[PDB]
Amino acid sequence: PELPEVETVRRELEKRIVGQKIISIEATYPRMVLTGFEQLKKELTGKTIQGISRRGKYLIFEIGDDFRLISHLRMEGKYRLATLDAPREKHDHLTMKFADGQLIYADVRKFGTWELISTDQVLPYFLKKKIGPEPTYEDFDEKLFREKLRKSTKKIKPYLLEQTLVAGLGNIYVDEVLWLAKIHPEKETNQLIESSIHLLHDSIIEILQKAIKLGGSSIRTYSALPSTGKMQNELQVYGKTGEKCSRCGAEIQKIKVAGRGTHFCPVCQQK
DNA sequence: CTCTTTGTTTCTCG
DNA sequence: GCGAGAAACAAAGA
Ligand SMILES: [Zn+2]
Incomplete structure (x- = not known):
């Protein structure tokens, strides 16, 4: 997706997952979490999603007071909100499970990335990317x-x-x-x-x-x-x-x- | 069978 | 530093 598509996703997720406590996090493709999947699971399980922002084509989940999950969907990444009993689909890679549904990330080409960083690291992160x-x-x-x-x-x-x-x-x-x-x-x-x-x-x-x-x-x-x-x-x-x-x-x-x-x-x- | 193409980014090579 | 080309990966079409 390009910026308009990422913004569209941002707005729809903002309506629906802000306020949700993350009950558990599961991965079938943990290597797309560039900061480490087990580390992300330990830090974010039990935290509440407070907001979703965007910078360029990057989505930024604001989770707890101090965590930012920077997600890039690259060429084919797709999020969806599913029931907790929803069946697995072939290219599903990660899920955040809530009490009444789950947020699933899928990506056929496995290009998309997740990086967990702290609030005060977000502006330096995008300065290092040289984003205009x-x-x-x-x-x-x-x-x-x-x-x-x-x-x-x-x-x-x-x-x-x-x-x-x-x-x-x-x-x-x-x-x-x-x-x-x-x-x-x-x-x-x-x-x-x-x-x-x-x-x-x-x-x-x-x-x-x-x-x-x-x-x-x-x-x-x-x-x-x-x-x-x-x-x-x-x-x-x-x-x-x-x-x-x-x-x-x-x-x-x-x-x-x-x-x-x-x-x-x-x-x-x-x- | 091979080759090309695809909403992105970032690398090597010379 | 630069541009060209390719890699990461999967699927579809010629
Ligand atoms: Zn014209």
């Missing part, structure tokens, strides 16, 4: 963004995917943002002029906030969190190879850019 600002008008300063683009020869799509200029874009929304802002994904960032950088800055905020409002993009339907979103109905280029651009009618093309499938309009996004 949240994609809001308040936090995403166009002036610094512009200065970073001016001094780089990186291509704009891979630079945006780094999470360092701004947090939260992945392959779907980077393609969507660059189409909206009329910028080719291979454009070297030091060639962007000020008005293009302004449109790109605003398009990043607008696309991601719209996707949040619409509950994320469901490219397939799944029996887990979140509830089926509506943003997939608004995608203009991602996965639309061979369909016509809604602005100019040219066929959307797909190329490979720094190892990633890349969807763009060749008319609207001039090389």
